[PDB]
């Protein structure tokens, strides 16, 4: 089937970056899930979606998909470039600031 190779992005709700180092090969859900009539649970016949592989480099993920005859898409990551402030903390008190800094 089709697998996704991508680098998971930082969770916006948190500032930590430890869950952004690894590449993952994922088997995205293949068919719709259903509602169990008896209890309302989420039913599925797609056990392949249980599989989630973890790699250190994009090459390792791409290799594995090739050796195993998997059609894959590689989604490139969007690293956040450092916002280098030329004056650093001092720009809060620059004489040419549009408005006073709020602290």
């Amino acid at each position: 089937m089709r697998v996704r190779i991508y680098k998971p992005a930082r969770n916006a709700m948190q500032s930590g970056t430890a869950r952004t180092r690894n590449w993952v090969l994922d088997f995205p859900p293949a068919d719709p899930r259903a509602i169990d009539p008896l209890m309302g649970w989420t039913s599925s016949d797609d056990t392949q979606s249980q599989v989630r592989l973890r790699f250190e480099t994009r090459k390792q993920a791409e290799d594995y998909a090739r050796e195993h005859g998997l059609d894959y898409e590689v989604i490139e990551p969007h690293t956040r470039a450092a916002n280098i402030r030329p004056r650093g903390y001092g720009e809060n008190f620059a004489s040419d600031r549009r408005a006073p800094w709020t602290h």
Partner: peptide, 30 residues
């Protein structure tokens, strides 16, 4: 880059530094 703050340099070196008030896209508060 000498204009980097120590926290930005630490991240470039892959060293974790705890923080609450700092955000990359906001003014430094401290």
């Amino acid at each position: 880059d000498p204009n980097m703050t120590l926290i930005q340099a630490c991240e470039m070196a892959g060293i974790e530094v705890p923080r609450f008030c700092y955000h990359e896209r906001l003014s430094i508060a401290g």
